[PDB]
Amino acid sequence: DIVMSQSPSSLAVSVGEKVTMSCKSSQSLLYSRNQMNYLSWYQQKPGQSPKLLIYWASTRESGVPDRFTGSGSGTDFTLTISSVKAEDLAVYYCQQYYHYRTFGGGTRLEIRRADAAPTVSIFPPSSEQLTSGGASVVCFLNNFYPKDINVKWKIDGSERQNGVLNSWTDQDSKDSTYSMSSTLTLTKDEYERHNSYTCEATHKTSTSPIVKSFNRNEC
Amino acid sequence: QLQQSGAELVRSGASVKLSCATSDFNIKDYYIHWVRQRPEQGLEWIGWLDPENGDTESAPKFQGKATMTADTSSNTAYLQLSSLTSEASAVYYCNAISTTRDYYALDYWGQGTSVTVSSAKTTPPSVYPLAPGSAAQTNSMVTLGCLVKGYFPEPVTVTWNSGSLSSGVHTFPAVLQSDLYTLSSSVTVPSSTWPSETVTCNVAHPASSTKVDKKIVPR
């Protein structure tokens, strides 16, 4: 059984820069009476199926930009991208097909871009959900960078750190920003018990917390 | 272009039958490989099948636990996984490879099949429209959302206006809370387009043949 290891586990680079990631196998992938390296590189963009980029260590698959270059022999291999495009965002894997087939742990490529403050939106519960005894308050924080962000909920001034669901989207292939959803679920009764609801966010992009809120009273 | 069967929910200890078909070529001119990806996990090779003669091979890990067969009549490939455990919950891909054709290796991938191994029952989701609160029109851009709550298992598909609205759309990864999935999606359109024009989010939950269309109407 051949083990594959890749480094870095992840890195971030800005558009236009060159990038190099390596792959190591515990055993040589160079077949003696053949002179071929049984290694391949795959790329997997978020939500998509993986795609073959390189095989035989250096043969580029047709339809693969010349930006990608595969080198190495034996136990050491590298994948290089001359000028990174925002569309190159994805996880890269190397696979050995010498003895069975095994994939390395993969290298995650992120894109570095200019900082961007998030656009925040808060939503009261649906009249339909309330008619069912539930009450979920939602807050969206879209198109921001870097990914690091702090969100806290407040109800009538009191913060709530229990019953909050948060989800981050993968970096956007177009603008390279991140978006996030934060849902606070309560019972209709607890919801009808209070008046003010607040979604408060802290991002390095501002020295002041971005706040959004509403009062159940209004319509 | 490869077509795979739909999401499957199977009971622990049961078995599953996965299909991979095509009509854009004879599956006899290819080798069929199955690959799986567990949540927040890397790629894992399972085995290959030569439709041409029925020859197959499985990774040690899947020995005598994964039957692979083919029906070249309907140009379909199958993969049977027996005595499934919770660990087998993942996204299964089929990959059709060929190098005997042209000076370049032919590489095709399926879209993937989500297999969830659990003792829980399928649960259709509740779709709630998220309209802005009174204060959200005195601006230029407006954000709307749909909350897809309490479903099982993954995945769900969400579109807006049947795909006519894609720019400005953000669909957040589902979060698991109390053995049920919750996911949300947002779309931002010009304040001049909504509410003047109708915005609808469409939700489909394969596992339960559930189809929902929920129009976003102002409060």
Listing DSSP states for B163-191 in one string gives GT--TTEEEPPPEEETTEEEEEEEEEEET
Domain encompassing residue B180? 120-218
Q: Does residue A65 have a cis peptide bond before it, meaning omega lies within 30 degrees of 0?
A: no
Give yes or no for a contact between A210 and A201, defined as CB atoms under 8 angstroms apart. yes
Question: What CATH number is associated with residue B173?
Answer: 2.60.40.10
User: A140 — contact with chain B (CB < 8 Å)?
Assistant: yes
Q: Write out the two tokens for B211.
A: 């189809």
Q: How many angstroms is the resolution?
A: 2.2
A137, A32: one domain = no
A98 touches chain B (CB under 8 A): no
B67 beta partners: B80
Contact B69, B19 (CB under 8 A): no
Own/partner contacts of B67-71, CB < 8 Å, gap of 24 or more, are B68/B32, B68/B34, B70/B27, B70/B32
What is the C-alpha radius of gyration for chain A, rounded to an integer number of angstroms? 24
A58 touches chain B (CB under 8 A): no
Q: Which of A106, A167, A169 sits opposite B175 (nearest CB)?
A: A167
Instruction: Verify that A89 and A144 share a domain, yes or no.
Output: no
Burial class (CB in 10 A: 0-12, 13-18, 19+), A21: buried
**CA atoms in the 13 A half-sphere facing the CB of A5:** 5
Before B129, cis peptide (omega within 30)? Answer: no
Pair B116, B12: CB distance under 8 Å: no
Chain B environment of A50 (Cβ under 8 Å): 35, 43, 93, 109
Torsion angle of C-alpha atoms B16, B66, A24, A75, degrees rounded to 10: -160
CA atoms lying within 13 Å on the CB side of residue A92: 28
**Residue A62 forms contact with B (CB below 8 Å):** yes
The answer to whether A142 contacts B170, with C-beta atoms less than 8 Å apart, is: yes
| Residues B110, B14 within the same domain | yes
**In angstroms, rounded to a whole number, what is the distance separating the alpha carbons of residues B99 and B183?**
42
Name the domain count of chain A: 2
- Give the residue on A whose Cα is nearest the Cα of B92: A49
Task: Specify if A219 maps to a domain.
Answer: no
Last residue of a domain, one of A113, A130, A155: A113
Does residue A100 contact residue B59 with C-beta atoms inside 8 Å?
Answer: yes
Give 3-state DSSP helix, strand, coil % of chain B, rounded to 5.
Answer: 5, 50, 40
In whole angstroms, what is the distance from residue B212 CA to residue A116 CA?
35
Q: Does B108 touch chain A (CB under 8 A)?
A: no
Tokens of A60: 């580029």
Neighbours of A1 (CB within 10 A): 10
Q: Which of B109, B132, B147 sits opposite A50 (nearest CB)?
A: B109
Distance to chain A for B184, nearest Cα, Å: 7
Do A104 and A119 fall within a single domain?
A: no
Asked whether residue A93 is assigned to any structural domain, the reply reads yes
Q: Is there a single domain that holds both residue B34 and residue B45?
A: yes
